[PDB]
C-alpha cells in the first residue's frame, strides 16, 4: 500500500501542470501582443511575377490574437489566475474581433473582385464609378485610429 501510494504521489508530481501555465504567461508578457494602432496598414511588397513593388493593402490585425483570448477564456475557468493586463488585452481583443474579421474579409473580397475586373480591361471603364466610391470609403476609413 505504501509503495503504491509513493508511486502515485511521484507520478502526480511528474504530472504537475502550473509550470506550463506560468511559462505561457511569461511568453505572452514578453511578446506583448496588442492590436492598438491603425485601422489597417498599407505595406510594400515585391510580389513575384512583376518587377514593381506592390503596395498591397493589409489589415493591422493579427488573426492569431483571438487564439490568445481563447486561451484566457479557457484558463480563467481552469482556475489559473492570469495578470490583469493580460485579462484586459484578451477581453478587448475578444470584443473587437468581429469588426476586424468583417474588415479583413471585406478588403480581401474587394481585392479579389478588383483584380478580376482589371483582368478584363474591357469592363473597368464602366465599373470606375463603383471603384471610385469604394476608394473614397477606404480613404475615409484609413485615417481612423
Amino acid at each position: 500500500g505504501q509503495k503504491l501510494k509513493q508511486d502515485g504521489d511521484s507520478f502526480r508530481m511528474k504530472l504537475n501542470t502550473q509550470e506550463i501555465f506560468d511559462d505561457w504567461a511569461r511568453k505572452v508578457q514578453q511578446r506583448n501582443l496588442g492590436v492598438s494602432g491603425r485601422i489597417f496598414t498599407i505595406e510594400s511588397t515585391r510580389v513575384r511575377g512583376r518587377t514593381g513593388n506592390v503596395l498591397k493593402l493589409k489589415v493591422n490585425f493579427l488573426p492569431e490574437i483571438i487564439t490568445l483570448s481563447k486561451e484566457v477564456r479557457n484558463l480563467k475557468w481552469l482556475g489559473f489566475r492570469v495578470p490583469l493586463a493580460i485579462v484586459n488585452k484578451a477581453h478587448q481583443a475578444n470584443q473587437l474581433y468581429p469588426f476586424a474579421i468583417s474588415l479583413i474579409e471585406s478588403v480581401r473580397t474587394y481585392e479579389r473582385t478588383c483584380e478580376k475586373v482589371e483582368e478584363r480591361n474591357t469592363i473597368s471603364l464602366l465599373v470606375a464609378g463603383l471603384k471610385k466610391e469604394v476608394q473614397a470609403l477606404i480613404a475615409e476609413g484609413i485615417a481612423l485610429v
Binding site: 491603425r38 496598414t41 498599407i42 510594400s44 514593381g52 506592390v54 503596395l55 498591397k56 493593402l57 478588383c114 482589371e118 473597368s124 471603364l125 470606375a128 464609378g129 471603384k131 471610385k132 476608394q135 477606404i138 480613404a139 484609413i142 485615417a143
Partner: peptide
C-alpha cells in the same frame, strides 16, 4: 467620363498620408 485612378496610385498616396499622420 469616370476615371479609373489605378489602384497603385491611390494606394501610394494613402501610404504617404498614413506615413505623414
Amino acid at each position: 467620363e469616370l476615371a479609373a485612378e489605378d489602384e497603385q496610385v491611390f494606394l501610394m498616396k494613402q501610404q504617404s498620408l498614413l506615413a505623414k499622420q
